Amino acid sequence: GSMAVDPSTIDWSALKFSWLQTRSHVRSVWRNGEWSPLELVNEPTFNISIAASALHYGQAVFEGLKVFRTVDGRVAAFRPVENARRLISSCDGLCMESPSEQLFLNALAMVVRDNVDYIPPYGTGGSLYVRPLVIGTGAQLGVAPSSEYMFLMMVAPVGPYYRGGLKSVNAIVMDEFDRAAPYGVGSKKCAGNYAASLKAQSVALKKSFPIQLYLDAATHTFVEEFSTSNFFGIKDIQRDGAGKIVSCTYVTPKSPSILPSITNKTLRELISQYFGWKVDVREVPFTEVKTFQECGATGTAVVVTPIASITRGSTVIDFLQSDDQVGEVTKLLYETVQGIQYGVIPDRFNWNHYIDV
Amino acid sequence: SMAVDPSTIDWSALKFSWLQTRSHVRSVWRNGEWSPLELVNEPTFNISIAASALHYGQAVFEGLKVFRTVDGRVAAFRPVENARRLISSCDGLCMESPSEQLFLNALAMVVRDNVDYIPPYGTGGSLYVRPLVIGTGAQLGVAPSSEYMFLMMVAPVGPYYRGGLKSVNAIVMDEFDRAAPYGVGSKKCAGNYAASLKAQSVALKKSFPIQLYLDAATHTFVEEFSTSNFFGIKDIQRDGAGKIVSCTYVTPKSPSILPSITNKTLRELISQYFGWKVDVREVPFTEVKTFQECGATGTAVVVTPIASITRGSTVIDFLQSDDQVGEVTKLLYETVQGIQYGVIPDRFNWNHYIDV
Ligand SMILES: [Cl-]
Ligand SMILES: [Mg+2]
């Protein structure tokens, strides 16, 4: 019976990326062919069958997107239609029912309006993290798709991921670990993929690597992605007489096993249609990694994680000399995404879904 | 929702379905310890909307059976094997786990409390026991949960074969894997089963009730079925009356395979009880057509005789009718059940008796 955090007392500057109990979440339940009307729920728990399919047989997928208080005082969700469609794709891959795009967008507006006082104010660099979830809740023993599903959407304010500037990190390649089967569910944002990566995480954390890069499980010769973020590389950077970048190539792996990052898609669209440079979505052999001039990971919580080095066995590929250093194009991407998200750069590609609050 | 009245259950008509009994047993882990076991009558619990099990998949389970035996006692079949595998599955997903003794304490408690749901001797039914460990701490970052819950629930299930073994047709899923080469295929974890459902629906649409996987790494070696191990029987030799006196039990070896306790039981029966040959090794798919019998094995079925295996356009036929069944397969089925129900002496002390 725990109480909501008082929004008027939240020190936004101390926020990191943690669970925080806001006023409400929204809920809908599927049975007999239809979702029930969306409802606000104040208590951050629900009653689940001890036999729920989500707990025994893994029918559980989720999403992640951000809502922002913009420079002119409005509220916008960043590309939520992309999340609604990926949620449907994750559900389908696990034989789960899913809310339609419109039900998803209705849930978002409903939950954002009821928790509007939890959106970190403009100037904090914070945001409202949105976590949609679909889980099989029917009680069953045989291994089969559940007959009942629940769609939840919860929110929590998070602080600026980079309080005080972009920082680069060291990555390790997991040679004795896979994150996805070649013909598996690596492209679905499903619960099981994350627990299946925890053992590799602890091995990498014990060696002081905050991020783990995976190669393709089939041959272990091509870059796949990090455990919770896509991989990209930058090369062929060319500049004019003023030092301005006038050309470069953004490279990112292509594979049915890779989670299709919406931030990655955003970066590709910025590289080619906003800045007018080259984008390559193709197989990235690991031997090519040493030819990249910049390397990064991409995902909603970080936008980008600049990669200072990649370690595989005893071979080290060094991109940046210090964690203070970050790739120039990588930083440009970060600032351009954030400029659009917060309303400072005009939203040329209509990525911002404004919510009337 | 109310518990099913045990005096109204038609034991012989039961299949393998969820049924609400009197109670389950629960313990929660926090701050370094599991809480004292408690019986809970209501078959739901309050779970955080941000629970690690729901978002990041820290959820593993077990399955074993409890039997009312011929002399009136109650026994669980090899429950220490389940306790040790539960710990192994938990370790693989960086989850806390109950100790063997806590698991056995939980088992005796839930079995005694639900004794009226154990199908009586003569029914061929049993009490299926479903242990479960789940991450229950609320968290946003991907990391092992700080809180876990241990549940053990039960349901009566009927005789899987009411009226003799029945064989089935299997299909090899060439465009689907069940486990990565360096993944969690050897852990009995929730995510493995949802990840198999798409392949399952494709096979059912073609009228195949069981799906066989080859190794994800090369697709040339037998791995296992989606929820049961594979074995083959060959080199069958008989005495002058046709009694089987020699054979070879072959089952695939791989770090991706869930180590089936029923498979382990069959290997121990073949070698230590009957004195025949057991080979735990890789089985290239080209060898499958040389098996005289083929089977799937797991707790719910004991064995499923495999009548045929279809891969692409190639069909391997083992049995001509769903009525016809391989003799070694049937012997193994009857010997396991004979031990489970107390009719065959429990030479290897596999039966864990529970005071009820
Ligand atoms: Cl313990
Ligand atoms: Mg322990």
Contact between B21 and B4 (Cβ < 8 Å): yes
Of chain A, the end-to-end C-alpha distance in Å amounts to 28
| Amino acid occupying residue B79 | P
Residue A28 to residue A103: CA distance in whole angstroms = 9
Token pair listed for A139: 């009680």
The three-class DSSP label of residue B295 is: strand
Distance, CA B102 to ligand 1 centroid (Å)? Answer: 5
B10: helix, strand or coil: coil
Tokens of B172: 């090899």
Q: Would residue B41 be called left, alpha or beta, if left means φ above 0 and alpha means ψ between -120 and 50 degrees?
A: alpha
Which candidate in A23, A24, A46, A55 is best for mutational testing of the B interface (most B CBs within 10 A)? A55
User: Chain A 107-146, CB below 8 Å of chain B: which residues?
Assistant: 129, 131, 133, 135, 139-145
On whether the CB atoms of residues B111 and B23 are closer than 8 A, the answer is no
Classify residue B80 by its DSSP letter: H
Residue B271: left (phi > 0), alpha (psi -120 to 50), or beta?
A: alpha
B334: number of Cβ within 10 Å: 14
Which residue is closest to A47 within chain B, CA to CA? B46
Q: How far apart are CA B189 and CA B202, in angstroms?
A: 22
Encoded amino acid at B313, one letter? S
Partners of residue B129 on adjacent β-strands: B64, B154
Q: Shortest CB distance from A193 goes to which of B53, B57, B144? A: B57
DSSP letters for A245-291: EEEEEEEEE--TTS---HHHHHHHHIIIIIS--EEEEE--BGGGGGG
The whole-angstrom separation of Cα B111 and Cα B142 is 36
For the purposes of burial, counting CB atoms within 10 Å of the CB of B325, is it exposed (0-12), middle (13-18) or buried (19 or more)? buried
Which tokens go with A294? 């910049």
The one-letter amino acid code at A79 reads R
Q: Return the amino acid letter for A314.
A: S
Contacts of A19 (CB under 8 A, 6+ apart): A156, B50, B138, B139, B140
Tell me how far apart the alpha carbons of residues A268 and B350 are, in angstroms, rounded to a whole number: 60
Give chain B positions within 8 Å (CB) of A51. Answer: 18, 43, 130, 153
**What torsion, rounded to 10 degrees, do the Cα atoms B326, B330, B332, B338 define?**
180
Beta-carbon contacts of A268 under 8 Å, excluding residues fewer than 6 positions away, are: A250, A252, A279, A281
For A118, list phi and psi in degrees, rounded to 5.
-95, -5
Measure B128 CA to ligand 1 centroid, in angstroms: 23
The tokens for A349 are 């590609």
Record: contact B194-A179, CB cut-off 8 A: no
Pairing state of beta strands A315-318 and A303-312? antiparallel
Q: What is the three-class DSSP state of B13?
A: helix
Q: Is A53 annotated as a binding residue?
A: no
- Three-state DSSP state, B53: helix
The C-alpha angle B78, B81, B87, rounded to 5 degrees, equals: 145
* C-beta neighbour count of A355 within 10 angstroms: 20
Q: Is B33 exposed, middle or buried (0-12, 13-18, 19+ CB in 10 A)?
A: exposed
CB contact under 8 A, A144 and B197: yes
* Interchain CB contact of B210 with A (< 8 Å): no
Taking the CA atoms of chain B, what radius of gyration do you get in angstroms? 21
- Are residues A217 and B182 in contact, defined by beta-carbon separation less than 8 angstroms? yes
Q: Which two tokens stand for residue A267?
A: 């970066």
The answer to whether residue A98 neighbours chain B at the CB level (below 8 Å) is no
The residue count for chain A: 357
First and final CA of chain B: distance in angstroms?
26
Closest-CA residue of chain B to A227: B142
B175 touching chain A per CB within 8 A: yes
Please report which ligand is nearest the Cα atom of B35. 1
Which two tokens mark A201? Answer: 């995480």
Cβ–Cβ contact A184 with B under 8 A: yes
Closest CA to B125 of B17, B31, B207: B17
Helices A262-269 and A80-93, interaxial angle, to 10°? 130
Q: Which residues pair with A251 in a beta bridge?
A: A233, A280
Going from the C-alpha of B20 to that of each of A50, A53, A56, B119, the distances in angstroms are 10, 15, 16, 14
What is the Cα–Cα distance from B108 to B102, expressed in whole angstroms? Answer: 10
Q: How far is residue A60 CA from its own chain's centroid? A: 17
* C-alpha B233, offset from chain centre: 20
Q: Are the Cβ atoms of A191 and B55 closer than 8 angstroms?
A: yes
Indicate the helix (H) or strand (E) that contains B47: strand B44-48
Cβ atoms of residues A329 and A237 within 8 Å: yes
Residue A193 DSSP SS3: helix
What is the DSSP-derived secondary structure letter of residue B289? Answer: G
Q: Which residue in this structure is represented by tokens 């009228």? A: B207
Chain A partners within 8 Å of B180 (Cβ) = 178-182, 184, 217
Q: Which residue matches tokens 């049915």?
A: A256
Q: What number of C-beta contacts closer than 8 Å exist between A and B?
A: 227
Phi, psi for B297 (deg, rounded to 5): -140, 135
Strand (E) or helix (H) holding A89: helix A80-93
Distance CA A179, CA A200 (A): 9
Residues 67-96 of chain B with CB under 8 A from chain A are 92-95
> CB of B220 within 8 Å of any CB in chain A?
no
Q: What's the CA-to-centroid distance between A164 and ligand 2, angstroms?
A: 41
How far apart (Å, rounded) are the C-alpha atoms in residues A207 and A190? 27
Other beta carbons within 10 angstroms of residue A187's beta carbon come to: 18
HEC string for B183-235: CCCCCCEHHHHHCCHHHHHHHHHCCCCEEEEECCCCCCEEEEECCCEEEEEEE
Which sign does the torsion angle of CA B157, A139, B84, B101 carry? negative
DSSP B51: B
What does the alpha-carbon distance between residue A206 and residue A199 come to, in Å, rounded to a whole number? Answer: 11
One-letter identity of residue B97: S
Distance of CA B178 from the midpoint of ligand 2 (Å): 28
Residue A33: burial class (beta carbons within 10 Å; 0-12, 13-18, 19+) = exposed
Q: B126 has which bridge partners? A: B157
A-proximal residues of B, 24-53, CB under 8 Å: 24, 43-50, 53
Judged by CB atoms closer than 8 Å, whether chains meet at B198 and A58 is answered as no
Q: How far is the CA of A33 from the centre of ligand 2 (A)?
A: 42
Question: Which domains, and CATH codes, for chain A?
Answer: 7-158 (3.30.470.10), 169-341 (3.20.10.10)
Q: Which residue, among A97, A141, A221, A229, would best test binding to B if mutated, counting the most B CBs under 10 Å from its CB?
A: A141
Query: Residues B290, B234: contact at Cβ < 8 Å?
Result: yes
Which helix (H) or strand (E) segment holds residue B48: the answer is strand B44-48
Which pair of tokens denotes residue B251? 């089952």
Say whether residue A336 is in contact with chain B using an 8 A CB cutoff. Answer: no
Measured from the alpha carbon of residue B90, the closest ligand is: 2
- Phi then psi for residue A56, to 5 deg, are -90, -45
DSSP 8-state class, residue A87: H
Answer yes or no: are the C-beta atoms of B26 and B132 closer than 8 Å. no
Q: Which of B184, B187, B180 lies closest to B215 in space, CA to CA? A: B180
| CB spacing of A144 vs B182 below 8 angstroms | no
Contact of A251 with A232, CB cutoff 8 Å: yes
Structure tokens at B135: 């991450």
For an interface test with B, the pick among A179, A183, A212 (most B C-beta atoms closer than 10 Å) comes out as: A183
Angle (CA) A204-A209-A211 rounded to 5° is 90
Q: Specify the amino acid at residue B126.
A: S
- Residue that has been written with the tokens 């008796």 in this structure: B353
Residue A166 tokens read as 């972009």
